[PDB]
Amino acid sequence: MQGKDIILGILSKKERSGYEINDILQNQLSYFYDGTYGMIYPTLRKLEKDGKITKEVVIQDGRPNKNIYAITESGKKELASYLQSDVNDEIFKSDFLMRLFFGNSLNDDDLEQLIREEIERKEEKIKRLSENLEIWKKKGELTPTQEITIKYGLAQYKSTKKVLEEELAK
Template identity: 45%
Template structure:
């Protein structure tokens, strides 16, 4: 999934690895954690797959800067991923943890919980549809 986070950022515009790492940690990190080393490793894989292109910019007195740009193929991969719905079974999910520990609750309590959850998701969907 990290690759799609990076591709999504690059769809906004070309960036250096440093900029991707910084923006990732300021935004996407709230729901997807990635270490700097993972981001740079993924950038290499994305380049090998032809999903991004890197251009090296020489800098005086500083290390060269690699600017990453999403390619047509990368945009197509991102779009395909965005269009394919998937159930999120994240490792860190308060909802799933609650469900795991509901065994001792009555069937009525469990049913009420899932109805409330369904209402919340329905409300969120309605908000998105009217946005």
């Protein structure tokens, strides 16, 4: 699963500025796509080169330039093809879990802190996903399949947060 595919997805229904695409990817869709920093800009560049999207540079007095991206016919074709494709294995790499797995030396304080910091991360993600669920629902935009993904995401966050809470409780 590539950044290019989720970006075409984001651009399927609307022309969007880079700001808006980044907002969607970082703040809305991160419960199912959270990769490495700085994927978006090189990937937008390649999608443009490959003719899957267009880029418009909007100039305004006294403001930074704004880039507006729009899917092309070929881009829509590529998205449609991708959604017809066999599902790829999920990718999951948890640094937190790695630290605990290889955490023989961790003293009690260091371990306790790692657990608390991860609990806070889960709380932040739950809050954000919960807030988007509410807004999407309020706006009448949430589709039934989207609803499933949110229920899935929340369950994921809450179940693992609970494990850590239960650990801290002893």
